[PDB]
């Protein structure tokens, strides 16, 4: 028996969690075993580990006539609300109030977060992933390549064009070949973020292709005329070979390939994990120095940082109507908002990846000195996964290096980070419109943008038809619904 | 009458026929009633909804296109391979060719796809490398909608053309030599032979195989496409079978899908009827 | 178009085997000559060597002055009728005949005339627009022959043309072939495994066994005076009897076989056979009669009846003499009744003897 | 074909024929020897200019990765199961079924024949088949995969054709001896039908081994996954865990080299049995 | 055993088509009877109906007193020898022979005596242990017969057994069948497309043209007095010559042929002839001779020599009279020259006459 047990008799539940198009829940995970030990609740995964697309798998599960006891993953928020309203998911409100003191307290101290996860009916159908921190992504460049080529860090877009062109052309990696790739990212969408240099938003938040607000008016960054003029230039950059050709494909291995292979000259990514590589590959790539830079002055004469760490990502887990133990499950969920739960869901397992020192969790030296980023290590273990849990920034601070920290402070002091878009409150009726057209519209937008980047389609020629397609596919209808949600709340 | 007697006699034998008939009813004929259901009833409207899609109409427009290319390049190739092997002396050399040419058939379609993606990858794939050797620069193949069909039909001939050549080869092997020897006495030439004897004698085989080939003509390249089609190639690559799959299974839209499936199936039956007619009529 | 083919020491070798052993035969112009023997002898292999369908591994053959070894079948002035159905199933009969000529074309008029001729000969005129799919096997072989005579060769090559035909058709076609040779008169080499077609059709018969050539001569030469025991057993409607015998007391007079029988011999000067000499005594079934030969002046053979198979106005009597049985062709019935004893009377002028070791002709 | 050599219009033609067919043969044999070498080569070698044909820097490292992959061997097991037992079920449903179909004393000979054959030119289509699989309770089920696809019309009419080709005098003699139906089928007609049996068991075999679509559609549980599905994940999709990204740097194999090793380990059993198969039919 | 099979009005109908029309045949015990005719015919279907491989759609057929119409082939007490040899190419030869008796009855059946006998009959000592995939078609058919004779049935059924065998082998096996029936003696009905085997093997022949039954009688009965033009042209080693003819001025005296020819006729009785009657004059090749040797006069005929095919001590002469040709069997190896006229002396006793319409024998 343990003091954190939510049940006397051991309880085993069926979870469907397939997330980030990469991982599924593993009951054989060390963190899962620890969670079972402390909660007396074992979660057994039912999902295809051979599957690729996670969203697809969720949609298939919901239509298969049988639901598991718990469903979890990333970017299911809208689906949590929809299928919660349709009865696929149970309201957790009474369960939280009676059986979940930690979550209840959390929501009391965070009315904004709770508001963000609520459905139009006022119900909470899932327990969210709650991030901890302020800044998220920043621009990183190779200082050693700048020094070998005797170049100064670019203060502006033009200077960066010239620098990436120098990266493209004469041997920054010194192998006598043209093989070098100036810009790389593990996230394809970041290529669109390049439009920031031309004065266009690619998003309103950390969520890609999210809406934003300008002067009391709701806009989508991709539907704006400025976006066209920026995308022209990014398509030029791809055409000139400055952007990684595989940027839409390569994804999760990108850094490891391009930086490890000494091909990559520039990126835009999270401070900590990006800075880890300086220590990691320093033996394989002797001169490698990757440093944080302030965003270059863009064409509009401003310094934009579009990304920030957010409050309540649209990720987490929910309890189905077929779950025969709702109380035990809500207690179990509440565990992850307690101290021990946060400890295992953040730091992995004690005696393995971390120890308790002075009442705080301290990573093992074996973990900290590993060439692989700590968070990746944790993913592979079942930690830092988008279940309902409360993130602890200390976990990240432990592997955050001084240069990284100084980059963070540089971005904080300069106020470069743009205000993030938190959301709007729709009623049951209008949200139906949103949910009907939005996923497909977003898909279409992505496809089009990818067509433009790779140069398979001319942006200028297709812009008109693209706008028309946006209207006929219901984007602007959704936009009016979003606006009607906005103007009621905020007046003066 | 006669029946009962026979049956009383044609049982143990009549027993064997039953499970096969049970099977066909259950896994084949029972789904046709499902055809009838997914066809709260109606219906015939989502047929006109399926009629109007800018993505769909281009999928049939792509379908019959790919059918055209597969008929042009794909079909005559195993006949060609058949004739070319039959003209080979040297015994084992020919043998050596056959084992080489037949082997790709046994390579799985998904593995074929993987061979393609690994060969055509930019900066990695051997093909692009060989292009960089002679100064052809590089091309990212799977993303380009221009390259989809050539890559496909070519990979398909590589995989299936020899195994498909086997049949025709056997057919031309079944011709009694007397036709050839007597032709040689009159002084025919090898080309004169394949044009004036081998091909005309093998025609009934190629006509029969063509009407089967036409039977599936609308489903050509399904597993390949479903594997390799990227967003940028969605336009050229998407075919009726794929559309049906995406909406019906993936997108979980059944009725509209099943209906599209009907359209496809009826058109296939029609084209195989129109095939078999002209075939049996004109060729023997 | 009447020409002579001489074949000198021709030998075929496939791998290590050497199918034909250096066969040599000279063929007079206008002559109908038949190669005949069992299966596996070089009959077809030789014929095809003439045609150019098989390489000549040694020796030379020539038509008239031309040595055709390194030549091509097209240029060898030959036409061949094969064993199996050489017509093409898609083409009509007219096109089947005209095929070879349409290889080089050069006009439709010339080939029209040629086809006119050939069709008139084989009576193929009504069959012109018809198709091989529906034709008699004999009709198929007729049009196949039309293919050959439209080439107008120096030599006609026949490889078992009649083999796949039924007997009824075979006798008819055989007659047609003879008649045909009368009409045309072109030199022809004809290959058969059937003794009958050889005896009937051939001016000269050359019998071959296992790559070698056993004997040559007019049909009646081979029939009356076979070089060896094999040629004796081969030609003729039933087989010649040929049972082992001996000599004993005296020589040129008496020959005895296993049945405790003794046969006096007509002198046939130049024979010189030794007393006691191991020998095989042949006699043909037509040359043996029943007791109606009146008392057997020379004291003829004794036998016991095995079976009688009635056929025509004739009948085949199987009698046994000692450990061996002789077959005699008698009239078209009679009581006989197998199991009783019987006395046969041998014609003394038609008897043949062959040595046991050397299978040659002796008497 | 024609034995005796001769004409120029032949000789030149024949040579250029052997050359063209040769080049084609080389093109067809090229990808197989490539990945074999590429699987053996080193990540750094394959990643830029090398290989092209023969190995280069060796190191043999990717194979370890695949050898320690549990899903790989699990899936291979699944496929061996599906091919063996799938073939057996197909045979048990077809061989006797076609045997009855061959004897034309059957009343249904006309109509049962139409029933079977009609499935060739018309199918209910993808979705109806899947749904009928659903309400038969065969989804995510191995027996569902076995019994789901066993009978093909082609293999049936082919089998019945080779049966019919055999003279009826054997069955007749058997009946004369008292042997009835089934005991004939096993005693005489089956050992007479060995070539057709071969072609059938072969076609069914490859159908099971290389089958992908309906497996990945009808299966959910990963432990039931049959190779080519899992293969679809690793060999084509090509997006991976941060785990594999981290394994990449501590190893010196490549993504490409691992892929190569994988498709090699996938095609080896086929490259092995293949001559045996061909040697049979190529007599 | 020795048993009697009676067949009464046996008829089988396929669809609405009646294969055999009211066939009735009574077969004596131990009698060897042969069914014979054209290609498609109810001989094989009748035999099969006896065997029980085909159901009886009408009429009754019984062996001894037992009616076999509705019965099991196994219980039909019959043995059948197939054309296709019908032997399992798996089991050993001895195992094939003992197969039927080894289904039941081991240990006190003993099986050894019967197989000893049957082994001696077909004379196979070494062939006891073998496989059908090895042994030749002749030996295959031998052991095939071994299966039947080891069964010890009441009736032997043979459907064209040596049809697929070669001629040289066919004759040998024919003799072996004769001898076998003499040695054993079980009742046997034997189906053939070949006239020769019918003449040789049959105690009684029954000829069936498609549909009904054409004629029944001893071989010599069918040879001497054909029922119709078909029985005449079918039976005999060469065909009986048949040419159109007439009568004119008087009847029982003269019958006239095409070109310039008339034959004095022997009157006999039961003839019922009549002047001017359209008629076909049959005569066998052996029943025509050369010019007369003895003779003479009103029995002669005038022709022109077409072709002569030497067979041996015999020669086949094709003589043209009118637009039609008749064939005579010559005692030749003598000399006749084609194209010149020749005289033929017909045996007046052996002539046959058939009505042109009725197609049946008037004379
Ligand atoms: O890198 C760090 O230092 C770091 C520190 C923090 O402790 C925290 O763990 C943070 O985790 C990040 C992680 O670094 C990646 O940036 C990750 O990227 C996600 C992204 O957030 C989206 O969830 C994205 O969703 C995809 C989905 O996977 C499918 O592909 C779908 O088709 O498209 C959606 C989409 O809208 O993009 O997946 C990305 C991914 O997994 O690569 O985000 C986490 C995070 O916690 O936010 O890293
Ligand atoms: Ca470089």
Q: Which residues of C touch E337 (CB under 8 A)?
A: none
* C279-282/C243-246 β-pairing: antiparallel
CA distances from E70 to D174, D183, E25, E182 (A): 19, 23, 19, 32
Residues β-bridged to residue E310: E315
Distance CA E199, CA E196 (A): 5
Give the span between the Cα atoms of E150 and C277, in whole angstroms. 46
Please tell me the experimental approach by which this structure was elucidated: X-ray
Phi, psi of C10 (to 5 degrees): -70, 135
Q: Closest-CA residue in chain A for D234?
A: A50
Q: Is the CB of A16 under 6 A from ligand 1?
A: no
CA-nearest residue to C54 within chain D is D4
Q: And the tokens for A209?
A: 């292709």
Surface-to-core class of residue A232, CB atoms within 10 Å of its CB (0-12 exposed, 13-18 middle, 19+ buried): middle
Candidates A186, A399, A370; CA nearest to A272 is: A399
Q: Indicate if the alpha-carbon torsion angle A166, A171, A177, A182 is positive or negative.
A: negative
Listed in sequence order, the DSSP H helices in D103-212 are 111-121, 126-134, 142-148, 153-165, 169-177, 182-184, 190-192, 194-209
Q: What is the 8-class DSSP label of residue D188?
A: I
Chains in touch with B (3+ beta-carbon pairs under 8 Å) read A, C, D
Q: Give the gap in angstroms from C-alpha E13 to the nearest C-alpha of chain D.
A: 14
Between CA A405 and CA A398 the distance in angstroms is 11
Q: Do B and D have ≥3 inter-chain CB pairs under 8 A?
A: yes
Take residue E347 and report the two structure tokens written for it: 């045996």
Q: Name the minimum distance, in Å, from the CA of A182 to any CA of chain D.
A: 17
Dihedral angle of Cα A117, A119, A125, A130, to the nearest 10 degrees: 0
Q: What phi and psi values does residue A319 have, to the nearest 5 degrees? A: -100, 120
Helix (H, G, I), strand (E, B) or coil at A357: strand
Spatial separation of the C-alpha atoms in residues E19 and E22, rounded to whole Å: 10
Stretch (H or E) spanning C262: strand C261-264
Interfacial residues of A (vs D; Cβ cutoff 8 Å): 21-23, 46-52, 177, 179, 249, 251-253, 255-257, 260-261, 280-281, 284, 371-373, 376-377, 379-380
Do residues C306 and C325 touch, judged by C-beta distance below 8 A?
yes
Contact (CB, 8 A) for C29 and C5: no
Q: Nearest ligand, CA of residue A172? A: 2
Whose C-alpha lies nearest to ligand 1, atom 14?
A270
The angle formed by the CA atoms of residues C72, C7 and C198, to the nearest 5 degrees, is 105
8 Å CB contact of A456 and B143: yes
Q: What six digits make up the tokens of C33?
A: 């000559």
Distance of alpha carbon C287 from alpha carbon C345, whole angstroms: 9
Residue pair A267/A193 in contact by the 8 Å Cβ criterion:
no
Cβ neighbours of A246 in B, within 8 Å = 122, 140
Distances in whole angstroms, Cα of residue A338 to Cα of each of A333, A388, E258: 9, 12, 128
> Which residues of B, range 204-233, sit inside 8 Å of A by Cβ?
231-232
Among B141, B232, B253, the residue to mutate for chain A (most A Cβ within 10 A): B232
Counting from 1 in the atom list of ligand 1, the atom nearest the Cα of A53 is 32
Measure the CA–CA gap between C100 and B191, rounded to whole angstroms. 15
Helix (H) or strand (E) holding A312, with range, is: none
Residue C79 pairs in a beta bridge with: C156
For chain E, first and last CA: distance in Å? 43
Q: Which residues pair with A292 in a beta bridge?
A: A140
Q: Which residue of D has its CA nearest to B10?
A: D106
Q: By the 8 A CB rule, do E188 and E156 touch?
A: yes
- Tokens 């627009």: give the residue: C129
Which burial class, exposed, middle or buried, applies to E64 when counting CB atoms under 10 A from its CB (0-12, 13-18, 19+)? middle
Q: What is the largest CA-CA distance in chain E?
A: 82
Angle among Cα B163, B169, B171 to the nearest 5 degrees reads 125
On whether the CB atoms of residues D81 and D207 are closer than 8 A, the answer is no
Q: CA of E46: how far to CAs of C78, D104, D119, E43, E111, in Å?
A: 52, 20, 41, 5, 32
Given CATH 1.10.3720.10, say whether it is the number of domain D1-283.
Answer: yes
Structure tokens at D213: 């679509």
The CA distance from A239 to A168, in Å, is 12
CA nearest ligand 1 atom 28, residue:
A20
Alpha-carbon span B201 to B82, nearest angstrom: 14
Reduced to 3 states (helix: H, G, I; strand: E, B; else coil), residue B52 is coil
**Domains, in order of start, for chain A:** 1-132+311-399 (3.40.190.10), 133-310+400-492 (3.40.190.10)
Strands (E), A86-200: 127-130, 137-142, 181-184
Q: How does DSSP assign E159-185, residue by residue?
A: ESTTTTS-HHHHHHHHHHHHHHHHHS-
DSSP letter (8 states) at residue D224: G
Bin A46: left if φ > 0, else alpha if -120 < ψ < 50, else beta: beta
Looking at the CA of A205, which ligand is closest? 1
Show me where the domains of chain B are located.
40-284
Query: How far D186 CA lies from chain B's nearest CA (Å)?
Result: 12
Q: Give the residue carrying structure tokens 């052997």.
A: D18
Nearest-CA residue for atom 37 of ligand 1: A208
Tell me, rounded to whole angstroms, the distance of Cα C144 from its chain centroid.
Answer: 22
CA distances from C216 to C23, C49, C227, C242, E345 (A): 12, 20, 9, 21, 36
Task: Dig out the tokens for E146 from the structure.
Answer: 């071994």
Whether A384 is in the pocket of ligand 1, judged by its Cβ within 6 Å, is: yes
CA dihedral defined by C213, C214, C215, C216, rounded to 10 degrees?
A: -30
Length of chain B: 284
Chain centroid to CA A132: how far? 13
Domains of chain C: 1-239 (3.40.50.300), 240-286+347-363 (2.40.50.100), 301-345 (2.40.50.140)
- Enter the DSSP assignment of E286: G
Q: What dihedral angle (degrees, nearest 10) is formed by the CA atoms of B190, B196, B199, B200?
A: -160
Per the CB < 8 A criterion, the answer to whether C273 and C267 are in contact is no
CA distance B201 to B194: 9
Task: Name, in order, each residue with C-beta under 8 angstroms of A56's C-beta and a sequence gap of 6 or more.
Answer: B250
Which chain E residues are closer than 8 Å to C313 by Cβ?
223, 284, 286-287
Continuous segment of H or E residues that includes residue E150: helix E137-151
- Interface size between A and B, measured as CB pairs under 8 A: 26
Angstrom distance (rounded) from CA B130 to CA A312? 50
Secondary structure element (H or E) that encloses residue C84, with its range? none
CA dist., res. C166 & res. C145, Å (int): 18
Structure tokens at A168: 């493209």
What is the rounded CA–CA span in Å between residue A138 and residue A273? 11
Mutate to test the pocket of ligand 1, among A277, A280, A375 (most ligand atoms within 8 A of CB): A375
**How far is the C-alpha of B266 from the C-alpha of D140, rounded, in Å?**
31
Total number of residues shown for chain C: 363
Among E66, E4, E76, smallest CA distance to E33 is for E4
User: What is the rounded CA–CA span in Å between residue C285 and residue E296?
Assistant: 30
Nearest by Cα to C325 from E175, E119, E162, E182: E175
Q: How far is E144 from chain D (nearest CA, A)?
A: 10
Tell me the sheet residues that pair with C328.
C317
Domain boundaries, chain D: 1-283
CA dihedral angle for residue D239, residue D243, residue D245, residue D248, rounded to 10 degrees? -120
Q: Domain spanning B40-284: which CATH class is it, in words?
A: mainly alpha
Pairing type for strands E5-11 and E58-63 reads: antiparallel
C103 contacts: CB under 8 Å, gap ≥ 6: B186, B187, B188, B192
Residues forming a β-bridge with A297: A156
Identify the DSSP state of A237. Answer: H
The Cα–Cα gap between B28 and B24 comes to 5
Q: Kind of pairing, strands A181-184 and A264-270?
A: parallel
Task: Indicate yes or no: CB of D52 within 8 angstroms of CB of B19.
Answer: no
Whether A20 lines ligand 1, by a CB cut-off of 6 Å, is yes
Q: Which 3 state secondary structure label does DSSP give A266?
A: strand
Size of the C and E interface in Cβ pairs below 8 Å:
77
Sole residue written with tokens 């006798």: C171
Tell me how far apart the alpha carbons of residues E243 and E250 are, in angstroms, rounded to a whole number. 20
């Amino acid at each position: 028996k343990e003091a954190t047990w939510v049940t006397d008799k051991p309880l085993t539940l069926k979870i469907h969690m397939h997330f980030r198009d990469k991982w599924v829940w593993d009951e054989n995970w060390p963190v899962a075993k620890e969670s079972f030990r402390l909660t007396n609740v074992k979660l057994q995964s039912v999902a295809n580990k051979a599957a690729t697309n996670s969203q697809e798998q969720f949609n298939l599960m919901m239509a298969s006539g049988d639901l598991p006891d718990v469903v979890g993953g990333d970017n299911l928020k809208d689906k949590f609300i929809q299928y919660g309203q349709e009865g696929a998911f149970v309201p957790l409100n009474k369960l939280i109030d009676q059986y979940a003191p930690h979550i209840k307290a959390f929501f009391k101290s965070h009315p904004e977060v709770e508001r963000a996860i609520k459905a139009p009916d006022g119900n909470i159908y899932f327990i969210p992933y709650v991030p901890d921190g302020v800044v998220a992504r920043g621009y990183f460049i190779r200082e050693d390549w700048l020094k070998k080529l005797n170049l100064k860090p670019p203060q502006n877009i033009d200077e960066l064009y010239t620098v990436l062109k120098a990266f493209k052309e004469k041997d920054p990696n010194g192998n006598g070949k043209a093989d070098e790739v100036p810009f790389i990212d593990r996230h394809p969408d970041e290529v669109f973020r390049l439009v920031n240099f031309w004065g266009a938003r690619s998003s309103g938040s950390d969520n890609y292709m999210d809406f934003y607000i300008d002067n009391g008016r709701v806009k989508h960054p991709w539907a704006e005329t400025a976006f066209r003029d920026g995308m022209k230039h990014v398509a030029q950059w791809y055409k000139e070979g400055l952007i990684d050709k595989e940027i839409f494909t390569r994804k999760a291995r990108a850094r490891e390939q391009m930086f490890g292979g000494n091909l990559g000259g520039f990126t835009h990514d999270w401070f900590a994990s990006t800075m880890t590589f300086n220590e990691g590959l320093a033996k394989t790539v002797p001169g490698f120095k990757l440093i944080p830079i302030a965003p270059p002055t863009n064409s509009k004469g401003q310094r934009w940082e579009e990304d920030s760490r957010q409050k309540v990502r649209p990720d987490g887990w929910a309890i189905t109507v077929k779950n025969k133990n709702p109380v035990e499950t809500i207690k179990f969920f509440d565990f992850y908002f307690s101290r021990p739960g946060r400890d295992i869901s953040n730091f992995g397992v004690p005696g393995v990846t971390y120890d308790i020192k002075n009442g705080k969790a301290v990573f093992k030296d074996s973990v900290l000195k590993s060439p692989q980023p700590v968070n990746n290590q944790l993913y592979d273990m079942g930690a830092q996964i988008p279940i309902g849990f409360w993130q602890d920034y200390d976990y990240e601070r432990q592997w955050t290096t001084p240069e990284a920290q100084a980059g963070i402070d540089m971005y904080v002091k300069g106020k470069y980070v743009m205000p993030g878009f938190e959301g709007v409150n729709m009623t049951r009726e209008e949200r139906a419109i949103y949910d009907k057209y939005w996923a497909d519209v977003r898909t279409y937008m992505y496809e089009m943008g990818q067509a433009w980047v790779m140069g398979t389609k001319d942006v200028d020629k297709t812009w008109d038809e693209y706008q028309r397609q946006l209207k006929l596919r219901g984007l602007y209808q959704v936009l009016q619904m979003m606006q009607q949600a906005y103007d009621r709340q905020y007046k003066n | 009458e006669r029946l009962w007697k026979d049956i009383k006699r044609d049982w143990l034998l009549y027993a064997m026929l039953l499970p096969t008939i049970i099977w066909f009813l259950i896994f084949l004929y029972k789904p046709m009633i499902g055809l009838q259901m997914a066809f709260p009833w109606i219906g015939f409207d989502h047929f006109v909804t399926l009629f109007q899609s800018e993505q769909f109409i281009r999928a049939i427009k792509n379908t019959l296109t790919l059918s055209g290319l597969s008929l042009l390049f794909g079909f005559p190739m195993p006949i060609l391979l058949a004739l070319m092997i039959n003209e080979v002396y040297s015994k084992g050399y020919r043998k050596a060719v056959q084992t080489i040419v037949y082997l790709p058939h046994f390579i799985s379609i998904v593995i074929v796809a993987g061979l393609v993606v690994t060969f055509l990858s930019p900066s990695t794939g051997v093909v692009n490398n060989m292009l960089s050797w002679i100064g052809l620069d590089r091309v990212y193949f799977l993303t380009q909608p221009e390259w989809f069909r050539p890559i496909y039909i070519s990979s398909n001939i590589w995989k299936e053309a020899g195994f498909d050549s086997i049949v025709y080869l056997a057919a031309i092997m079944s011709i009694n030599p007397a036709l050839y020897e007597s032709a040689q006495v009159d002084g025919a030439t090898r080309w004169q032979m394949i044009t004036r004897i081998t091909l005309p004698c093998i025609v009934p085989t190629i006509a029969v195989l063509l009407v089967i080939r036409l039977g599936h003509i609308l489903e050509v390249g399904f597993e390949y496409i479903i594997l390799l089609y990227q967003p940028t190639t969605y336009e050229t690559a998407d075919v009726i079978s794929t559309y049906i799959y995406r909406l019906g299974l993936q997108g979980a839209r059944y009725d509209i899908a099943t209906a599209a499936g009907i359209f496809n199936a009826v058109v296939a039956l029609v084209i195989v009827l129109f095939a078999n007619h002209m075939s049996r009529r004109i060729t023997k | 178009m009447v020409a002579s083919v001489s074949i000198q020491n021709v030998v075929k070798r496939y791998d290590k085997t050497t199918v034909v052993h250096g066969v040599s035969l000279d063929i007079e112009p206008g002559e109908f000559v038949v190669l005949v023997g069992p299966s596996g002898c070089g009959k077809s292999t030789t014929l095809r060597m003439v045609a150019g369908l098989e390489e000549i591994s040694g020796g030379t053959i020539r038509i008239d002055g031309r040595v055709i070894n390194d030549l091509a079948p097209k240029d060898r002035d030959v036409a061949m009728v094969f064993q199996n159905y050489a017509l093409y199933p898609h083409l009509n009969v007219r096109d089947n005949i005209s095929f070879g000529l349409r290889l080089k074309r050069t006009k439709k008029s010339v080939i029209d005339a040629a086809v006119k001729t050939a069709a008139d000969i084989l009576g193929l005129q009504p069959l012109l627009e018809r198709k091989p799919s529906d034709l008699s096997g004999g009709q198929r072989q007729r049009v196949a022959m039309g293919r050959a005579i439209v080439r107008d060769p120096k030599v006609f090559l026949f490889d078992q043309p009649l083999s796949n035909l039924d007997a009824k058709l075979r006798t008819q076609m055989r007659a047609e072939i003879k008649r045909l040779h009368q009409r045309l008169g072109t030199t022809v080499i004809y290959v058969t495994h059937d003794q009958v077609e050889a005896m009937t059709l051939a001016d000269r018969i050359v019998v071959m066994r296992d790559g070698l050539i056993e004997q040559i001569g007019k049909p009646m030469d081979l029939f009356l005076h076979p070089a060896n025991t094999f040629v004796a057993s081969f030609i003729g409607s039933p087989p010649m009897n040929l049972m082992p015998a001996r000599i004993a007391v005296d020589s040129t007079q008496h020959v005895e076989l296993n049945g405790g029988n003794r046969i006096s011999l007509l002198p046939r000067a130049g024979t010189h056979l030794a007393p006691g000499q191991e020998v095989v005594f042949g006699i043909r079934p037509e040359d043996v009669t029943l007791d109606g030969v009146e008392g057997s002046e020379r004291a003829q053979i004794k036998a016991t009846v095995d079976i009688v198979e009635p056929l025509g106005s004739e009948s085949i009597l199987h009698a046994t003499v000692g450990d061996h049985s002789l077959v005699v062709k008698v009239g078209g019935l009679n009581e006989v009744h197998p199991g009783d004893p019987v006395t046969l009377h041998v014609d003394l002028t038609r008897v043949h003897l062959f040595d046991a070791q050397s299978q040659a002709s002796i008497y | 074909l024609a034995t005796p050599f001769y004409s120029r219009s032949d000789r030149i033609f024949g040579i250029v024929n052997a050359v063209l067919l040769g080049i084609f043969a080389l093109c067809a044999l090229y990808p197989i020897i490539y990945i074999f070498s590429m699987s053996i080569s080193s990540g750094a070698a394959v990643t830029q200019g090398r290989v092209f044909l023969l190995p280069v820097d060796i190191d043999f490292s990717a194979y370890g990765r695949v050898l320690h992959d549990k899903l790989f061997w699990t899936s291979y097991a699944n496929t061996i199961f599906y091919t063996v037992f799938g073939v057996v079920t197909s045979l048990i449903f077809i061989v006797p079924g076609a045997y009855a179909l061959s004897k034309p004393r059957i009343r249904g000979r006309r109509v049962f024949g139409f029933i079977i054959a009609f499935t060739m030119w018309f199918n209910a289509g993808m979705i109806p088949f899947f749904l009928n699989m659903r309400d038969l309770g065969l989804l995510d089920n191995r027996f569902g995969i076995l019994i789901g696809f066993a009978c093909n019309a082609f293999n049936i009419i082919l089998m019945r054709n080779y049966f019919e080709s055999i003279s009826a005098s054997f069955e007749e003699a058997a009946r004369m001896d008292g042997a009835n139906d089934l005991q004939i089928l096993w005693k005489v007609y089956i050992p007479l039908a060995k070539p057709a049996l071969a072609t059938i068991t072969l076609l069914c075999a490859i159908s099971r081994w290389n089958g992908y679509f309906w497996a990945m559609v009808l299966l959910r549980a990963e432990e039931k996954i049959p190779l080519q599905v899992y293969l679809k994940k690793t060999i084509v999709d090509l997006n991976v865990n941060e785990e594999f990204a981290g394994a990449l740097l501590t190893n010196s194999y490549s993504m490409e080299t691992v892929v190569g090793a994988i498709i090699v380990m996938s095609i080896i059993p086929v490259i092995i049995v293949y001559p045996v198969v061909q040697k049979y039919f190529t007599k």
